[PDB]
Paper text:
Atypical 2-Cys peroxiredoxins are functionally monomeric, in contrast to the typical peroxiredoxins, i.e. the resolving (Cr) and the peroxidasic (Cp) cysteines (C61 and C95, respectively in the case of Tpx) are situated on the same subunit.
The six chains superpose well, with root-mean-square-deviations (r.m.s.d.) of less than 0.5 Å. The redox active site of Tpx is made up by CP and CR (C61 and C95 in ypTpx, respectively).
Numbering used by the authors:
A (entry chain B): 1 to 167
B (entry chain A): 2 to 167
Amino acid sequence: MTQTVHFQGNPVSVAGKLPQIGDKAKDFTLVAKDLSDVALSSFAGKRKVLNIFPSIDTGVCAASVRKFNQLAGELENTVVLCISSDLPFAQSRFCGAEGLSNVITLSTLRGADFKQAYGVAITEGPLAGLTARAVVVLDGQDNVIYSELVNEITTEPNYDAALAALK
Amino acid sequence: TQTVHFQGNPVSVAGKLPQIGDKAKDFTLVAKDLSDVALSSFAGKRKVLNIFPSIDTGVCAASVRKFNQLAGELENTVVLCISSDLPFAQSRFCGAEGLSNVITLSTLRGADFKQAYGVAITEGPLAGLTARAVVVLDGQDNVIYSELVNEITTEPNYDAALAALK
């Protein structure tokens, strides 16, 4: 049913279960910056860092996208996917403004059942309808090699543990 | 359904834009602070609903800045800028541009608004967004003007919209 994360300590309900090491991750379809629909299966044979966050237009989500963008640079055989409920238009504005060329931004504009399938759908309170903060790392065939449902939404995910799984 | 266009290409929009004489449906949308704001909260005020695809595209942005300059001369009126942008996008924009008169609302929640107001882009690349539309409401939520813009890359008719307020 639900996971519990927090916002400045206040409990926030998140539906489903974040995928765990060993699970087969579900194929999903999300909206890329040209408004085309992009399936996880398009990335077959590459590893995938899914950096999931509430919104690129808030501060800690923006920090995680700069960070992963800088880290994507020296990753081997990996795509870094920045995923949220932002419209594709916000996401590309931010990456265009900040010179963040490595990440691929994807929106739940369409393909929203993703939130449900990846256990990141906030279901209650002022954040209901946004994704929680999470990192999922997937191998070339979409097996989970790492995941972290960030306990406190006002803190950044653990970048080093996430990318360790790629080594 | 209804058809409008984007660079000449038909785009279907579900529902039917309310027409003069109709009682507009009571919506609840998401304001900048993530609180849920009902149309009824604006009782006794006229409302200009500026509905567009996204504030982070150029035509939508031009209409928010125009309605915002026009909003300052309006009597007994609130100007609601409505889209499927997240509240955060709407707030970033209005704060960066000094656009302090409009009230932004998002379909983050309260998404039945799109259907109820005949503005839900149904198929194609724009699916999940609102079409471009202006609905003007009286103090009691009757429709005094509406336009479903025929071509999405053109601005709405500001002057006709606001005439209905005089």
